[PDB]
Amino acid sequence: GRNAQIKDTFNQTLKLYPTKNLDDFYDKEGFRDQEFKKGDKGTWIVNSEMVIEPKGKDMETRGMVLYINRNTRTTKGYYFISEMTPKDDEKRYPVKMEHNKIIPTKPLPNDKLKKEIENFKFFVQYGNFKDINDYKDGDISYNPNVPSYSAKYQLNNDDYNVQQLRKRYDIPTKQAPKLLLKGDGDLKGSSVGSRSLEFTFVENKEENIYFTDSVQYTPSE
Ligand SMILES: [Ca+2]
């Protein structure tokens, strides 16, 4: 049924974890459909972000996005910060990635920010998942409109990925998160369709703490 097609496409995403050297993406071809021109080897877009909005404060978002272009074999993007719940207060700090190092291309307003960039690791570089069918009490959702679909699982605080996130980020909640897998576009795949995952620590009306990651192969601009 649709649940098995949803699990299958999501398992294909989980399989990328980990890719510890980002340069390996220069030599990885993802799913190709008719939206790619014959001459375009594609671009991998990697995006990791941590969102922390504690009760009664601003929703602070910090993350990075890299465009790993297989045609140029060069990688550019930015580190971003937002304090808004496109984001109307986003500040982007440009970077490049060479030999698996993140290098700012303009000076930073302060050292804390320069060090966060320099030491940055995308969740694809260190995450590692089980087979999707090994996660426990999954709510699988399917909407034919887009179509869009999701798979939601409850994790435990001793889960390897949860521990890695708590090591690398100061996450102000003790709660074990949900693993939320999200996708849209034809189930077989689409260069225009999305795939993302989320570790949802807290989700309510006045407090939101979550981490999002996406690693996607797309046609180059
Ligand atoms: Ca896609």
Swiss-Prot record:
Q: What is this protein called?
A: Uncharacterized protein SAOUHSC_02783
Give a GO cellular-component term: plasma membrane
Alphabetical UniProt keywords:
Cell membrane, Membrane, Transmembrane, Transmembrane helix
Pfam families for the chain: DUF576
Q: Which Gene3D superfamilies match?
A: 2.50.20.40
Family (UniProt): Belongs to the staphylococcal tandem lipoprotein family.
- Secretion signal: which residues? none
Membrane topology category: Single-pass membrane protein
Q: Identify the InterPro entries for this entry.
A: Csa, Csa_sf
